[PDB]
Amino acid sequence: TRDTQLITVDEKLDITTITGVPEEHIKTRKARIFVPARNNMQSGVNNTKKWKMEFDTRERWENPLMGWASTADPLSNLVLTFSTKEDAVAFAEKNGWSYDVEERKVPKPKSKSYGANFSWNKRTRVSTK
Amino acid sequence: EAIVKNYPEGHKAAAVLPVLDLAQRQNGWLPISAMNKVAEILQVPPMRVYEVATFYTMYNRK
Amino acid sequence: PKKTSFGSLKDEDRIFTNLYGRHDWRLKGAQSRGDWYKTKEILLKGPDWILGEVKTSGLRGRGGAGFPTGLKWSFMNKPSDGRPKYLVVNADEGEPGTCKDREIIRHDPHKLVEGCLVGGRAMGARAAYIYIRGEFYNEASNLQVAIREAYEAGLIGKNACGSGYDFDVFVVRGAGAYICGEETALIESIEGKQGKPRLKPPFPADVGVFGCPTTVANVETVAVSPTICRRGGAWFASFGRERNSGTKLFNISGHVNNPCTVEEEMSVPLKELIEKHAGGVTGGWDNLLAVIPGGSSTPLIPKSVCETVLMDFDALIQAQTGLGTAAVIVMDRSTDIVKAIARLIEFYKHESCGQCTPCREGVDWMNKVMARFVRGDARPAEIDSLWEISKQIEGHTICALGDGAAWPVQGLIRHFRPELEERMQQFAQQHQ
Numbered sequence: 001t002r003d004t005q006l007i008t009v010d011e012k013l014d015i016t017t018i019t020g021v022p023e024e025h026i027k028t029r030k031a032r033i034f035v036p037a038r039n040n041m042q043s044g045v046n047n048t049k050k051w052k053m054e055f056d057t058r059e060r061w062e063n064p065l066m067g068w069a070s071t072a073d074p075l076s077n078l079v080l081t082f083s084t085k086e087d088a089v090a091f092a093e094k095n096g097w098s099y100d101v102e103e104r105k106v107p108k109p110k111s112k113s114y115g116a117n118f119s120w121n122k123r124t125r126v127s128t129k
Numbered sequence: 130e131a132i133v134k135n136y137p138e139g140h141k142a143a144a145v146l147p148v149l150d151l152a153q154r155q156n157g158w159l160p161i162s163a164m165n166k167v168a169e170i171l172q173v174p175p176m177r178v179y180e181v182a183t184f185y186t187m188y189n190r191k
Numbered sequence: 192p193k194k195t196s197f198g199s200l201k202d203e204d205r206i207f208t209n210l211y212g213r214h215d216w217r218l219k220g221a222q223s224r225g226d227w228y229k230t231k232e233i234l235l236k237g238p239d240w241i242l243g244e245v246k247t248s249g250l251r252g253r254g255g256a257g258f259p260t261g262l263k264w265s266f267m268n269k270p271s272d273g274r275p276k277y278l279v280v281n282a283d284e285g286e287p288g289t290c291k292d293r294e295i296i297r298h299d300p301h302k303l304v305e306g307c308l309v310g311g312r313a314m315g316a317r318a319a320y321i322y323i324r325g326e327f328y329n330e331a332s333n334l335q336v337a338i339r340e341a342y343e344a345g346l347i348g349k350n351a352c353g354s355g356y357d358f359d360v361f362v363v364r365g366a367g368a369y370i371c372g373e374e375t376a377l378i379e380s381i382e383g384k385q386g387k388p389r390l391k392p393p394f395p396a397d398v399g400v401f402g403c404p405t406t407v408a409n410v411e412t413v414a415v416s417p418t419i420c421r422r423g424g425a426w427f428a429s430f431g432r433e434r435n436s437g438t439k440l441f442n443i444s445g446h447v448n449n450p451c452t453v454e455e456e457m458s459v460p461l462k463e464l465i466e467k468h469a470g471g472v473t474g475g476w477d478n479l480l481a482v483i484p485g486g487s488s489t490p491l492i493p494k495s496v497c498e499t500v501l502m503d504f505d506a507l508i509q510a511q512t513g514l515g516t517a518a519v520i521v522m523d524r525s526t527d528i529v530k531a532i533a534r535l536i537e538f539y540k541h542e543s544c545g546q547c548t549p550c551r552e553g554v555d556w557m558n559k560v561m562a563r564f565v566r567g568d569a570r571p572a573e574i575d576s577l578w579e580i581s582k583q584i585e586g587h588t589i590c591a592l593g594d595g596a597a598w599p600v601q602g603l604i605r606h607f608r609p610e611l612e613e614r615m616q617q618f619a620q621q622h623q
């Protein structure tokens with residue numbers, strides 16, 4: 001229905017040449033596509049909803065003057081958020097990055113029964129409340 | 130031995146309150162050694178005896 | 192036809208005929224007063240018949256909640272799986288103002304022991320555990336002596352009363368915790384743990400003491416069962432208004448001339464109960480300040496309401512209070528009503544089990560605020576703050592003790608707010 005001429009391009013999308021990224025940070029970097037693990041100090045699960053893409057950690061050294069943490073990695077703080085795993089891989093492929101994908105780890109459902117704490121003939125009986 | 134036989138086999142821990150009180154009647158109060166004794170006679174962890182002694186007000190811990 | 196006035200019960204209709212220990216409490220005295228009579232026929236009649244007699248009887252629990260006993264006892268009238276079935280009799284009377292259960296144990300022990308068997312047969316139970324508070328040492332000994340006599344007579348134990356039904360009666364002593372009167376905290380104490388109530392579900396009728404089916408019945412609720420079966424449910428239901436039938440034990444205490452425990456018909460007007468049996472208020476009925484109809488757990492009511500209020504579950508609910516344990520605490524106009532109720536909050540702070548947040552932290556909070564209202568060291572804006580704090584404990588707690596701490600405060604604010612604000616005004620003037 002679009003009254004504008006279209007064309008057919010059969011090649012995979014590859015924008016590595018039109019992004020300005022130095023070649024060192026396209027070929028030698030390893031992206032990591034994952035769903036962040038729940039912070040074990042807390043019971044909330046609202047940080048385990050979206051996929052993330054982080055890069056491989058590189059050297060941090062000590063500034064001779066002040067002792068601060070210097071870095072030469074421009075991608076050290078880069079974290080991208082994606083709604084689905086496929087959206088994450090689609091974005092890494094067209095930027096030429098090499099990636100590892102880790103499948104989501106949902107906590108399996110469990111059978112909770114408050115009455116099992118007072119069982120007549122089972123070890124689930126609790127010695128205190 | 131009569132107290133521990135008022136309860137179903139496999140639920141000897143039910144005897145903590147009677148025996149722990151029987152210790153106090155003999156001794157007048159409950160030292161930490163008295164609690165540890167009731168724990169081993171009934172085969173319950175000593176903490177589960179400390180909880181009962183501190184919860185109830187009729188037990189004299191001094 | 193249906194009655195219109197209640198009270199003046201005849202000694203020919205009093206269930207507890209030895210309420211004052213004027214006769215022989217041991218066996219052969221109970222039998223001469225109608226106990227252990229024709230018990231085999233009741234047992235051989237069937238569990239359905241016994242429950243049917245208690246359902247028609249309209250009997251309701253005398254522990255403080257007043258649930259229909261017949262309906263409750265039917266939860267254990269179900270097919271028996273591998274687990275045993277027990278009956279727990281709640282003799283942990285610890286509600287301030289309540290002393291009725293103490294008299295039944297020490298003077299009519301054989302009525303309680305017979306009630307255990309009748310109640311057990313209805314529930315198909317194998318034994319009865321009677322939990323009696325540890326301060327009732329002498330009373331517990333009287334109960335233990337009576338149980339020995341019943342065993343030797345063949346009344347309980349192997350082939351109870353010749354019925355072919357096996358039933359044991361065990362007496363277990365508490366160790367001084369008011370919370371162990373709760374039906375699920377009592378069970379936990381029997382299992383040798385802290386007296387901390389469970390959550391429901393599961394109910395005790397499905398998972399109870401030792402994890403087995405159980406029913407917790409108050410001493411009075413059980414001691415009356417044998418008489419109901421002997422005299423039928425029609426006789427018991429003929430007393431009191433509809434859905435409030437029976438004869439109740441009252442404990443008139445506080446500012447009265449003759450503080451006493453007496454049996455009286457349900458729905459008896461409160462004024463008649465105080466004047467007739469307790470010899471009136473100290474200083475005359477016009478010297479009455481407020482009454483706590485059913486022990487500390489129930490909110491107080493002022494004089495204007497005591498003049499035409501009946502003593503039964505339904506009548507006192509319309510008055511913004513409850514029957515509770517039928518313990519009447521009377522306060523005359525010389526009483527410091529704020530300090531009277533503040534000491535009741537201090538009681539609950541000392542009996543809270545600590546398990547759950549709204550009562551571990553709230554009842555203690557209400558105690559500190561109340562201790563400042565006695566002295567008036569507060570501003571009037573805190574009264575509404577204390578009203579909301581109570582409403583956050585009520586219904587948010589595991590057990591009903593948290594409700595029992597909120598209700599006394601609500602009654603004080605409801606009917607005595609002018610006394611609270613006057614107290615604070617006095618303090619403000621001096622420390623201006």
Ligand SMILES: Cc1cc2nc3c(=O)[nH]c(=O)nc-3n(C[C@H](O)[C@H](O)[C@H](O)COP(=O)(O)O)c2cc1C
Binds near residue numbers: 371408
């Ligand atoms: C804090 C607290 C204390 C209680 N103390 C007693 C008691 O001492 N005696 C009693 O019969 N019921 C007591 N109850 C009521 C019991 O939970 C329960 O209603 C009763 O054991 C059931 O007996 P019933 O069938 O006669 O109502 C208490 C409840 C609460 C929340």
Ligand code: SF4
Binds near residue numbers: 388
């Ligand atoms: S309301 Fe109070 S007494 Fe009841 S379970 Fe909670 S903390 Fe324990």
